[PDB]
């Protein structure tokens, strides 16, 4: 499939092989032509996400005074508290 990479093998040589993410994937012909992501229930995934977010909450980025200054005229939503402009929409802007 033309996607292999040169791994370091034993101390002796290099080994040509598929990259891990490829080796981990089922990549047989049907999937490649026939596989579609399942349709999932919106709220169920938001709630499942929200569970995760509570765990990721203390590692979110923290902005110093100087960084808050830099961010003011580039990401207004920081000091304003709302959603960023480009992401407060209903979906793909072209389609809608």
């Amino acid at each position: 499939a033309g996607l292999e990479v040169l791994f370091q093998g034993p101390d002796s040589m290099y080994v040509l092989q598929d990259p891990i993410w490829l080796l981990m994937a089922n990549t047989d012909d049907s999937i490649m032509m026939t596989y579609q992501l399942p349709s999932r229930d919106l709220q169920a995934v938001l709630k499942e996400d929200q569970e995760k977010l509570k765990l990721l909450q203390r590692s979110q980025p923290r902005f110093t005074e100087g960084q808050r200054r830099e961010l003011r005229e580039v990401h207004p939503w920081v000091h304003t508290g709302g959603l960023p402009t480009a992401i407060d929409v209903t979906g793909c802007v072209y389609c809608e």
């Binding site: 990479v5 089922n26 490649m32 579609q36 979110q60």
Partner: protein, 486 residues
């Protein structure tokens, strides 16, 4: 007195301050390159990246020959090789181009330690960037700037740049000698793809041939193209410079000087806007951002990265990487990337949106790692930063509306020439269904001689459904950021 210049990312003879300085009372000079299968990044790398490097090595080796010298190429870990060479060649001078990357700094300190305990003076010069990156961090108060805008403000109030170093010419060498030997080649010769393990059977000549010589040529043609002016081509330009800057076949400082001189003649002032160096500065900004953050290329434990609950789906990633998504615009781009090793910046944006915040909801880290494997110009920090910004995981620049994997292609070219070029199986389809081929009436597919879901994949996502969903996933994320920044 024996001196060694160690090439890594500055594969050129022009503007090489560290090489030139090594040739001062040297007696003996030897240029060395050590094969690293990781390409100064977090990945192992594919056929086009390697071919580009090898051709950089050949040109460097050929150009050294003209100066009656040679390139010495060695396999191994630097920590293993240098102690042997020190004793074996009686080294007392070693020189490198500074590397601001965290991994490179660790490596260089370990080597500088081995050298010191072997009586070897170490020479370091800055020539991979326009500026001393640490001076920029100082001007910002001790921490690198978060936004490209702040970075621009800082560089605009910095000292004028000192001219490129004199290029290494026969005069420069000045009777300083490289001892060649019996069996120099095959013991220190530039390897070939076949020798490395690659299958070169179905392999056309490179759209992007490596080395300083081609870089310089392309630089001349690029400046002429600009001099005449004062998108049909998502396609590889003859004048593209980015892989050459990545490996130092073209010195950024030279390109900078050539740009300023042209600006001064075509226009009145000696005050060009910073946009003139947009390419150089964007690059420089990411080196600066990453130099003190060893986790710049990670989500977790990366203090500038938004923590996002990305989905895991090896099969969907695999489809995206092979350009079997069922979306022609995306597949075409990922196909050009696999075949050639370069895609347009707006195309990078398109495939990144689709993979991450747009449709698949897959970590930007996965995307980054595919680009590291296939993209000639990918640099550790530039590539990580982009992927972070493009997925709304960091703040280097304004966020934009997620590109549509159908409409962005229609705006670019409705004839779909790009698509047909990289996707043969689709060539028959009319412009009506060329971006949305699953919408073809079951007979139009018979005429095209391509059945959706037989000869070309079914669209892996209901794009509109996934977009609305993911956009909500994001809202909830940035909502919770405001709630905790409170």
């Amino acid at each position: 007195v024996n001196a060694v210049h160690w090439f890594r990312k500055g594969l050129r003879l022009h503007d090489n301050p560290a090489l030139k300085e090594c040739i001062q009372g040297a007696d003996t000079i030897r240029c060395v390159y050590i094969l690293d299968p990781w390409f100064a990044g977090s990945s192992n790398v594919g056929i086009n990246r390697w071919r580009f490097l090898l051709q950089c090595l050949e040109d460097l080796d050929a150009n050294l020959r003209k100066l009656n010298s040679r390139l010495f190429v060695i396999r191994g870990q630097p920590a293993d090789v240098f102690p042997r060479l020190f004793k074996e060649w009686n080294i007392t001078k070693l020189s490198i181009e500074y590397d601001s990357e965290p991994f490179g700094k660790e490596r260089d300190a370990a080597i500088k330690k081995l050298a010191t305990e072997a009586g070897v003076e170490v020479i370091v010069r800055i020539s991979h960037t326009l500026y001393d990156l640490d001076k920029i961090i100082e001007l910002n108060g001790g921490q690198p700037p978060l936004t490209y805008k702040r970075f621009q403000t800082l560089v605009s109030k910095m000292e004028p740049l000192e001219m490129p170093a004199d290029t290494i010419t026969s005069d420069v060498i000045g009777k300083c000698m490289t001892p060649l030997s019996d069996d120099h080649d095959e013991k220190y010769g530039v390897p070939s793809l076949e020798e490395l393990g690659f299958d070169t059977d179905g392999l056309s000549s490179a759209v992007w041939p490596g080395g300083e010589t081609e870089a310089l040529t392309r630089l001349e043609r690029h400046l002429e193209r600009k001099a005449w002016v004062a998108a049909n081509s998502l396609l590889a330009s003859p004048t593209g410079l980015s892989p050459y800057l990545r490996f130092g076949c073209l010195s950024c400082r030279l390109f900078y000087f050539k740009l300023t001189d042209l600006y001064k003649k075509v226009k009145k002032n000696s005050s060009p806007p910073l946009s003139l160096y947009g390419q150089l500065l964007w690059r420089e900004f990411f080196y600066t951002a990453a130099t003190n953050n060893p986790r710049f290329d990670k989500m977790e434990g990366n203090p500038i990265c938004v923590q996002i609950p990305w989905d895991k789906n090896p099969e969907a990633l695999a489809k995206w990487a092979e350009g079997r998504t069922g979306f022609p615009w995306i597949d075409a781009i990922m196909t050009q990337l696999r075949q050639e090793g370069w895609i347009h910046h707006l195309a990078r944006h398109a495939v990144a949106c689709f993979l991450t915040r747009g449709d698949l909801w897959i970590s930007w880290e996965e995307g980054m790692k595919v680009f590291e494997e296939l993209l000639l110009d990918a640099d550790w920090s530039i590539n990580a930063g982009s992927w972070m910004w493009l997925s709304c995981s960091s703040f280097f620049q304004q966020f934009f509306h997620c590109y549509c994997p159908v409409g962005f292609g229609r705006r670019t070219d409705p004839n779909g020439d790009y698509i047909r070029r990289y996707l043969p199986v689709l060539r028959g389809f009319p412009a009506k269904y060329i971006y949305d081929p699953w919408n073809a009436p079951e007979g139009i597919q018979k005429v095209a001689k391509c059945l959706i879901g037989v000869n070309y994949p079914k669209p892996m996502v209901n794009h509109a459904e996934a977009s609305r969903l993911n956009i909500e996933r994001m809202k909830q994320i940035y909502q919770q950021l405001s709630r905790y920044r409170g």
